Symmetry: D3
């Protein structure tokens, strides 16, 4: 029944209505966030049978997250409000472009995900299993969870799509590669941004040799992206649009690709689709508000 | 020379613009809170020389706490940004009155507060040293600070004011009673709200027997308040207005009482002043936004 | 198994942010309404298994109706988007109380509702079938549906609940009385608001004689309400709060009564529950935004 | 033919969206005010043919005054934009009720108003000529206009209505009393608010003796109002609603009284009408935003 | 006295504050719309004596429309609130550019306009008579109205300016041309957009031969426009500006041209002016909010 | 202790939330303004010991200004609320770019600054003394103040940095040069915009010969700027950013330069820094909201 299964800790996003330092702000918008959540919702809007695995707290915010996933029609068979608090963060985008994020996630009910965080018979028949580097950077349990996950998916013959999503706050470049070197063996698909490649490896190049998965997609910001399949290297043109809030764009990019593959799409149409979802998210507010719905696809370049 | 010195954990309050369940709110108002901070501003606006002692993380909200403090005129000699984050809390006020609160302050830069947090010589010549039962509830480190704090003011001939401000989310009634029995000997003035007394000492009367400090004041909500000084029991009438946002209405109360005290007025005037301040805030949004200014008093009533 | 099944025309409500004449309003708040939809959500939030049967056009607002329904947990097995548009209505609440309403629903996708709209077997084992006098007023097609609907639930041993909810803009008192005399035999529980009774049956007492259904409840605004069960007449005290937006306060009422019923409680508790729900909504904006959740009840009062 | 002609200084009012000290407000609501303008709109909305005589600078706000006037239907035959600026004023309404006002109108284009400001023949056949004690307080130039104005209406058999509307910021009680003793002989109807009477004539009763005009009405706030016509003293009950923004509640009052008068109704109806208008505005924001329309009356009450 | 006379059904516009699907919105801005209304108001702001012919409903929205036309100083001698409802629509502009509109106009009081919808002696002396394709697409009566109109105008020697404004929702391409083929004989001036030309004819070219009026202006989006007079073909440069809401731009374009002609302007200055008004409307929110006022003209390129 | 000392009259700014004529607006944002204030705050955010000299009124707005200067940590040793009103102005930015400002400053408490407006021993040790052409254009006293100021600064060996900031409303081009010709002798640094140079002199060229100060900086809008030191002429590249509200940009530019010099920066790094602060202010709302803080500098090109 289910084609994709993404997992990790969801978050509630607090953002200023316009650029400027957070200190001068007095009104914050609230959105639902979380790399996997963003992926889970983007896939669902596309008409893809997706399911999300994770925990929120027994508070008002966890209830917000659940309604978003539920209204979006994402499988929550293994998602539920567990005792504890729902993590949140505050963002701030400066006039010229400098941006910083403040987390209030340490200890959340969502950062508990330990191995066996669900029934492996869930993954049966499933095409993909998308996870993001943020999760394992959350808790020893989380790190344990990641690995276990893909293993149990591959065991079911389910392809493992992963997105680096390196976050400086959550851990150092070392521990990052350490994780990578370890989990790369089962990763059928790896999503990576250019900055990340040069921040954890120095030069995109070395990054690309160490991290060799069957299929690898490099998000190059507005310069589109590069998909690596069959030694052959494809390039994708980015959709030119005014970048409202670049947050969530990468996940939409990843979500767009996965829908491409799931629908058995040629590496080009999978890239075109990815850049499209990423331009929508970038062109809007919130973490995944701009995710398109299938019925919108046809009319988009 | 400073007349009052307040100290505790600064906080940032998030508030829906109107009643309802937080889960449905899309916007949040940002306010500078903290029990002792509220007391400190109030006094600052009243012309009383007040100093606040505390720590905000080295982030944007901490800067916002710092900028509000400076804006008011609260001496920050011993207040400063230190590594870590500034704690924040959300607030829900339901259609039928009763609402809930959610903290994001555990492990914050402010809940560090331990003994020798500031140079005691600070308290020299200071009329009062204000604390709140919230402070010692934040951590053993802070619990000790509280004790050291008043022992150091007592040693300086400074009056020690304490407001139970008991918060169940923080510690149990027992954990609270315990701190009270040990603190009380150092307390000259005690503020209490009927609820807290009944929720901690069965019935108001009992609480009063146990906490027999030189001067004790009982906030009875809009139903007035009794001041117990020298075997005498003055009862003070409450001001009438519609309960907007009552959060911190007690801190406004305490500050007005203290100001009158510091101003050497009768018990009947401290209670009026204290009642006026409290109502003005409860009629206002935020945590101490409605606190009146010196100029205003002369006419109000 | 479903305990309640509601059905009628979903609606989108537009509301000025505060009182005044609509002609001067520059902004409108968007809410999900519909009498039976309001009842359905309320129950959904209370833990009662409820199903809504209806149609929204194949447009953006219809999707919004659908997404709210899903968010709450209302079974849409027999609810779905069908060609046409979703009806909407504006709302004016004047400075001195009395306000006016304006519909844009004639010819909508929802006002189609005709016999055999859903598969009757749906009602199997269902405690109640809720309808509203609004439904049969929308069209001969819908008027028949109503009749067929309850005849099909009656045939299934399902209790048939009906709320007059008479709207003059829709049909005349006569056109309404007529539908009532013919419907009534199939009705087990009847909800009525003094006004509607006097505006349709001269005086409350008369209306009561004519509409003598097994169980009848009279909403007397904030002045309480009488429940007429088994020759007995229980009178239930109303909750006190300030009339924010009373629209749909009756649907909240009906839903709380039904829940208590479905929960097998005394008449005295159904009226309390019913009164609590109603007040919570009237104290809130939108159509059922203030409806309380299971968790909340345990403490409210 | 015009039934009423009003005249004075138009104004733009700036208002915080809710109570509190202006110093902290970051947004201001923009409204079209002016005592005589308020009276003029009210009448315009009531179906009474009214003309306003005044000047707005040749700027954007003046255009806004002009556009509101036109929108309502107030004859601007003798109203027009002239070099200079349009005056504006801010408004502060504190948590505990009492608030303050701040003018920015000195030297404005409207405070020019001098004798022969308009062609007197205008007043021909006009039931009333309305003025306000605000006008002559603006400048010797305007003070004279006032006098000339009513002497010219009296000369035309037009009734001269005057509303003390005393503003301390403008002139002293003396400077005001003085204008009153000299104006009064030309006044047929006088509106006064208890406060102004006590703040200018010690006690209400005294003021009444001094200002013995043919018809005199005493606005006693929400506590009603007495109408003194032909040795008789009719007392009119006030409408009940919560004091939103009371600014200009008196102008709404005066306009409703005048309308009833112009409509040849009993004193008991003018007071009801006058009380209704006033309450509707006080229940609304702005200066005359809540003023009801003809259509509305028929039902209100 | 009157130079131009435009006619058709006015509408109230409901629009999101930012891009994104209407389903995720919760606040809508309200503006007055209607191709002719937009034209009528734009002309008036330019200092052109214009008059609007049409009907709104006896509701709050029709009252909004009238105040806009009245405040803007547009002749309403033959415009009035007739019994019934005022039409409205909802718009939605997507992140990348895809847009869709939802109508709630079928049956409005404004869609009744049948022949003799006013006194032909109105058109005497009038230079132009602007109508738009939307009107005849409204009701058989409307279609009858259009034709009759121009006829009665030409009969008075008044030039007939028309703007295609093809709308897919309101009717098919066939019926569109059918109308065109019929009414073209009296159309002295035709306004057409490039998309329209290729959607009702296929290629701009054929469109331009079939539809041959004395003077024809082709709106080519941002690529400016082409005016066809005397076999000679002129081209106009579009004003480069960020396109806020492209709705209403075409009417402003048409309005700008007409003011050019009315003022006896060279085909170039008539085009320059048209592109200017169209850039203003495009550069702002609402349907015609951005229409400039004459006093602004000089300072604009 | 103090490095820079700027002086002049502060103002409160009222601005529309989006472009469009002020007449159509209904909500205004409030910000603190004043060329020197903007300079004073920008310097302080940079970590420069600055002090502001000037007067505000004894009203709510003067209290707003003081909190901004105080929170920003600007020396107010010689700044204080003197009896009287605080000046304000209204701005309005049109769709295409045309902008106009409306002043309500004539007579403000801040426009009194006469010679000896502070204790000259204030300037001791001070590096700079920045003033702006607006001040002397305010009141004869103000003009007297300007001159006296620099004199007393030079007397202390403090460099005199001045910014033309010609304002058409406040005075004519003649009186402007008249002032310039007079005060240029003590001006060590002159800031001038290109338009100003061609509006008071005709051609930038002549402007540059008459006005020859040791160091002169020409703000050329987005084309960066030109710094003239040692006969040598340097050029600065402007930061490309979308211009939100260009108001305050010049002062930020001036503030950025001064921080450059104060920090002993090479004419290039002083220009780079200036263009940076000017791009921030231009890229944000308000008069100086976008001023960066030192900790932000490193990460900015
Ligand atoms: N301004 C933009 N315009 C178009 N596409 C964008 C823009 N910003 C991001 N994207 C899309 O999102 C994908 C990722 O961009 P990127 O920002 O690097 O991911 P991340 O969320 O990690 O920052 C890109 O490959 C691109 O297709
Ligand atoms: N609705 C109200 N009206 C007037 N005064 C109030 C109101 N709510 C609180 N206060 C004032 O605040 C003081 C404390 O009330 P209380 O609510 O008990 O403090 P706390 O914030 O701890 O709950 C009271 O004694 C009273 O003077
Ligand atoms: N202002 C109010 N305060 C408390 N309860 C209210 C209020 N308005 C409505 N209710 C509740 O809603 C129920 C119905 O009131 P009513 O207004 O008559 O329903 P309806 O929405 O049909 O008008 C009442 O019996 C009462 O419990
Ligand atoms: N809160 C209120 N409720 C009802 N009517 C009010 C209220 N405030 C003012 N009014 C009406 O306005 C009229 C005048 O009240 P008042 O406040 O004295 O005028 P003013 O604007 O000059 O102060 C009153 O006689 C009354 O009818
Ligand atoms: N983004 C834009 N920039 C400048 N002018 C525009 C823009 N969008 C529309 N216009 C102006 O409006 C006129 C019509 O544009 P168009 O959008 O094609 O009409 P329509 O309202 O039918 O869509 C054009 O000829 C042009 O002058
Ligand atoms: N749109 C913009 N982009 C970048 N820098 C700008 C922009 N507008 C202004 N600036 C900066 O502000 C400085 C002054 O610009 P300018 O507008 O001419 O000063 P002013 O405030 O007097 O108008 C310039 O030299 C430039 O560095
Ligand atoms: O950055 C994080 O911590 C998140 O997971 C929240 C964001 O929505 C996510 O990163 C988007 O990429
Ligand atoms: O709860 C706390 O810790 C706070 O200090 C926040 C509020 O400002 C406080 O409760 C008001 O007394
Ligand atoms: O009036 C209707 O048809 C509705 O159902 C809309 C409201 O939600 C309903 O009146 C509330 O009972
Ligand atoms: O105070 C004034 O001068 C005004 O006219 C403004 C207000 O509209 C007036 O006070 C209301 O009566
Ligand atoms: O599109 C319609 O139905 C309208 O007439 C409303 C719009 O304002 C008009 O089309 C603008 O071109
Ligand atoms: O223009 C004026 O009058 C001001 O001083 C206020 C502005 O903030 C200043 O000019 C910015 O350059």
């Amino acid at each position: 029944m289910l084609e994709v299964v993404t997992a990790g800790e969801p978050l509630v996003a607090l953002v200023p209505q316009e650029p400027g330092h957070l200190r001068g702000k007095r009104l914050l918008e609230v959105y639902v966030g979380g790399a996997e959540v963003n992926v889970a919702v983007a896939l669902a809007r596309l008409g893809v049978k997706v399911g999300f695995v994770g925990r929120v707290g027994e508070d008002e915010l966890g209830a917000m997250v659940e309604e978003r996933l539920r209204a979006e029609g994402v499988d929550l068979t293994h998602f539920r409000r567990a005792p504890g608090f729902t993590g949140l963060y505050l963002r701030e985008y400066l006039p010229l472009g400098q941006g910083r994020v403040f987390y209030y996630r340490k200890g959340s009910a969502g950062s508990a995900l330990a191995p066996g965080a669900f029934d492996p018979d869930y993954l049966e028949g499933v095409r993909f299993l998308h996870l993001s580097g943020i999760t394992p950077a959350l808790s020893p349990e989380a790190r344990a969870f990641s690995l276990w996950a893909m293993e149990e998916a591959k065991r079911r013959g389910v392809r493992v799509s992963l997105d680096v999503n390196y976050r400086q706050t959550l851990w150092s470049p070392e521990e990052a590669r350490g994780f990578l070197e370890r989990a790369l063996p089962g990763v059928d698909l790896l999503f990576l941004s250019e900055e990340e490649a040069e921040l954890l490896f120095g030069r995109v190049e070395e990054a690309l040799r160490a991290l060799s998965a069957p299929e690898v997609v490099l998000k190059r910001g507005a310069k589109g992206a590069w998909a690596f399949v069959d030694g052959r290297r494809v390039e994708g043109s980015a959709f030119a649009v005014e970048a409202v809030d670049p947050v969530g764009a990468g996940d939409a990019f990843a979500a767009g690709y996965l829908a491409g593959a799931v629908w058995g799409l040629p590496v080009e149409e999978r890239l075109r689709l990815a850049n499209l979802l990423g331009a929508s998210v970038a062109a809007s507010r919130g973490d995944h508000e701009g995710a398109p719905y299938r019925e919108d696809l046809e009319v988009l370049l």
